[PDB]
């Protein structure tokens, strides 16, 4: 074994963010101790992971993440439509303006706005229940479900919140991710097919 | 006392109701300002930039009711009767007429002001008199000019914090139009607005301490004589306005260095990674476009371990 | 330009709407700020209380209107801060504020206008750079002067409000104690026409001083005498309800004593009043009419 | 013939002020030189009158006025019930703590208000149309309610103010209005007593 | 000052209720007799006396008195209407007919009515009411014209449905040119 | 710095498999004997590998080694319900009991659920009827995956019929007296 890999299973930081990182979560610039620790003993870290069947990796905007592969030993799970779309939005707000008032602070209502704002409330409700017309109970369900898959992505290193309570919160770099399909500029179907042989995804 | 006040305010039905047009005629009256004759041509050039006579009187007298508009009655005037505006009348007209005072040469000009006032009154507090010295040369310098020239550099921050709230939203619709093209812009509503709250500040503090020192000698001489518990009253309270302003104004500071500090992180994060703008776009498209094609992220998930019990 | 200004409003919706729960609130919240979010919501707890969803309702209408200004700020309780805007001061203000009006006051206000209108007339003259122009003559009057002439303006804005209270004050009086009331209502009446007067007397006072070293600067003066015109306009338009409001008073002075001449030493007991209306209803019971001369016109011809 | 007497018909003022007079006006302390010929020459001019079968009255409340006899040369009207109502309010408004705000001054509006307050609303209607809450009808008692205000600004009870009939003054005169009330008694009686003096009469 | 006969008139036991008729337009004929002598005995005094109240006590050629309004007057002023000024004009054409001197003075609301149809244009005269029902009112009409005339001393009824003319009607008589027949004159008025 | 015999483990190819598997809460015991062995070779600084994550690798009296999670464990945790461990219980009493030495080892669903209705009442079992019946031996048929993936047990052939019981499931042994009957005492922490 290396000398620098050692070195690196050897720091104080390295069992609890590995045990982060084989429950999926993605890792910022937000955790300087930690994405630090990733930057310094990359090479070999890879490498280390390689061994489990699953691939480290750092996304062009800097994170890290592990990308279980075909024969992992690590086992993988995916994330629901909802909070795809939970997701891409948060990359959104990522993105907008809206939050240079904000100073980075949105909120469970903002998230929930933007969302029925940029998708189908229909179809979004056709997850909550499969069939269901304006209903009022059906679009609790839809919040507390939105706000469910919001503590998941919490849970994934995507979002921090803020305070003791659940109600306001930021957002990570990590977010992007929701937002390989299109990140190179392509025929989405394309990079679809793409991603899912390389281990990003997966079809529903 | 403190539910009480609530208790005198439903008692007199006290209601300020000036949707977009009572307001506007408000304006206007205030855009000329007379008499009860031109209050009401008045009253037509706005009910006409939207019955005339009835809602006029209407609102003329809603308008006494809430004690937006003294009035006297003289018959020598046309419609019989004469019209002035109330304080509250002036303050809100103000508000969206009068122009920004952002001078530091305003500020320099008050504090000068305030500066001899409160000297005087301190000279004259410590050399001791009758009631009427005081009243006179003490007290009256406090409560008629410097108590009030407090509350005008109290307003100058007020206002230089709706200043503030503009700059932010330039900002926001600055990046939201030209993108990676608005940041030279952007990089000078920031630097130059931290300058100014940078100025108005040094001001503050460098007379500062002066002005609070006489407000103690003033204080300091109230304390041989018993009969006093006006001008005691008076300079604490004095006191505390300055502090409170002092406070408030290295504070509104420390905030728009946080916003100021998160803006180039935007700019660095946000920006500087997709700088067409494309990938936000497409990021839309692929938002109300998903459910034609879905596809979920995957992500190491390990099985967690059992433990007993 | 005049009608323009309209069109400007209603393109923003600027709209004050402030039934007496919003009102009743912002005056909590000027009372706490002589802050924070939760701080907002506390207030709106013993307002509401005083009769939460409600509560944000409440504060975003707040901001909407430009009541109040809003930072984001993290250490804060709630992620943040709340403070009145100049507008929500001034409304706040009118009504918590004790605006008590003193002779000495508007006196006080005076000095401090003389002085700062000549030492801008004497460096008015004396030439200079456009500093010693700027500085020394332009600033004075632009931030000093004109000031303190709209804190002048106020002053007499707000014995306007004394003087309709001393007309409240009289009525209900009059309409409770009758006869009584007299001498009492007598008392408010010349005690106001006296402290018009003494406003009046200072005003004039210092009236063609002010106007007089106003003029040394209009000869000696283009931004510049624009200002010395409206300056000597607002001095004018002052002194002038100044006046006017002494000749309006004795309009009520005289009439209030032709009300109690008239409509009290003629029925004491306010009994005729009573029956008077009594009759006004029960009058169908049984009606009368009144007489009068009724000469025939003098016919004439075409 | 009396000096004093002819002393008046002399005077300036007279005889506008007769035709005035003979006309119904009640003549108040508002007119200051007329009120102060009537009272100069009262006594006289009371003569005068009564050469036509008319008396010179003051009511006690200072007001001058013709009243016809049973015989007057001069001859004589009587108000309707409305201009009754509408005059009785006008005293009530003379006398009410509604006037002190107004600085002597009131608004058509206004007395109408009152009006429709003390009034039964329901025959004060009917007095426009014999049977009738119609919103035309509503009207009409406010355009007569109107004359019946003019008339009684003939008659010198009221003063228009200004160009126009929407702002007026109220005159001590109006007190006529309360007789039948104004020594307390039975209303009965006192109507009695004022068909026979023949200040007013029987609707 | 006023003059002793002034004075003396005033106190004159007619002259009550003759400034109340004076006043209201009456002409004063022969046949009042006691005003009638009572006036012209006073003419220069109350002539001033109400030219005081700005009227003109005036007597007409044919010798009858009344009160005419000047522009300023301060006596309350009315006019007649057309209709009145109609049939007084008529009354006149009656007064001078023939027909007079043999109906001994007297004529009838009718005649009055027909001499009107008959010397005026009936177009005018129903179209100022509004058919036979606009006649009968103008037929009550005239009727009413008649009586402000009676008031005025143009006629006396002699029961209104018969009645004299006076002399003071010669006011509605037209402009006569010096011994031209006064008939036609006045038919040309009428037109 | 990092022992020569540690970084010699973690290089093994058997580690990262059973890394995983023992941070699951799998117990190896003899029946993997490539893990096993492997285990044994490196107890001594394993052991002190795990404890880097707060959790301590342990190895029974009956020599089966585990991961027990400590209070402040650094892995993510989990718990078997009130079942997994009744059934847990169960295949220990199996494992005791001569009817394993007859079989030769196997069982079969059946007579697990059958045991599990005798030495436990029947009340609660249920309270966790014909459709409540066959709940409970679905629930009960997962409780043995859950213990499978555990190394309680293996599955014998193409299915889940028939199975094998570990020695590992002595963790859910009750407390021997040192001489006694395993039986008894285990039984009554069945009750």
């Known amino acids: ?204 | 006392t403190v539910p009480e006040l609530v208790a005198w305010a439903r008692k007199n039905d006290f209601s300020i109701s000036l949707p977009v047009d009572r307001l506007s005629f408000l304006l206007a009256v205030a855009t000329l300002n007379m008499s009860e004759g031109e209050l009401v041509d008045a009253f037509r050039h706005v009910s006409d930039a939207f019955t005339i006579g009835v809602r006029a009187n209407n609102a003329i007298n809603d308008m006494v009711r809430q004690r937006l508009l003294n009035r006297f009655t003289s018959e020598q005037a046309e419609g019989n009767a004469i019209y002035r505006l109330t304080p509250l009348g002036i303050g809100i007209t103000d508000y969206y007429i009068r122009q920004r005072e952002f001078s530091t040469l305003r500020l320099s000009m008050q504090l000068s002001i305030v500066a001899g006032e409160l000297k005087r009154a301190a000279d004259a507090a410590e050399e001791g008199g009758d009631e009427f010295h005081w009243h006179r040369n003490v007290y009256a310098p406090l409560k008629y000019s410097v108590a009030e020239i407090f509350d005008s550099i109290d307003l100058t921050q007020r206002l230089m914090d709706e200043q503030q709230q503009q700059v932010k939203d330039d900002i926001a619709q600055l990046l939201n139009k030209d993108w990676r093209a608005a940041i030279s812009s952007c990089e000078l509503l920031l630097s130059e607005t931290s300058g100014t709250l940078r100025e108005l500040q040094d001001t503050l503090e460098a007379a500062g301490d002066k002005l609070q020192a006489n407000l103690l000698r003033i204080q300091d001489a109230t304390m041989t004589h018993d009969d006093l518990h006006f001008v005691d009253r008076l300079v604490f309270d004095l006191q505390s306005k300055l502090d409170r302003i002092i406070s408030w104004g290295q504070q509104s500071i420390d905030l728009w260095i946080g916003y100021d500090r998160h803006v180039h992180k935007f700019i660095r994060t946000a920006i500087d990674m997709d700088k067409n703008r494309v990938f936000a776009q497409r990021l839309r498209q692929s938002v109300q476009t998903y459910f034609d094609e879905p596809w979920a992220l995957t992500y190491a998930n390990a099985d967690r371990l059992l433990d007993m019990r």
């Open chain 1, 1 to 204: 074994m290396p000398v620098k890999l050692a070195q690196a299973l050897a720091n104080p930081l390295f069992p609890a963010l590995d045990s982060a990182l084989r429950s999926g979560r993605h890792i910022g610039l937000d955790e300087l101790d930690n994405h630090a620790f990733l930057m310094d003993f990359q090479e070999y870290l890879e490498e280390f992971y390689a061994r489990y069947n699953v691939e480290l990796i750092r996304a062009p905007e800097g994170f890290f993440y592990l990308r279980p592969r075909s024969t992992t030993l690590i086992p993988r799970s995916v994330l629901s439509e909802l909070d795809m779309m939970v997701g891409k939005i948060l990359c959104y707000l990522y993105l907008s303006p809206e939050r240079l008032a904000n100073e980075g602070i949105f909120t469970q209502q903002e998230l929930y706005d933007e969302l029925l704002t940029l998708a189908d409330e229909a179809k979004l409700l056709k997850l909550v229940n499969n069939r269901s017309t304006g209903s009022d109970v059906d679009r609790q369900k839809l919040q507390e479900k939105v706000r469910s898959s919001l503590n998941r992505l919490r849970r994934l290193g995507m979002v921090w919140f803020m305070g003791h309570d659940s109600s306001k919160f930021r957002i990570t770099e990590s977010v992007f991710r929701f937002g390989a399909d299109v990140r190179a500029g392509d025929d989405p179907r394309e990079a679809q097919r793409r991603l899912i042989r390389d281990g990003e995804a997966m079809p529903i």
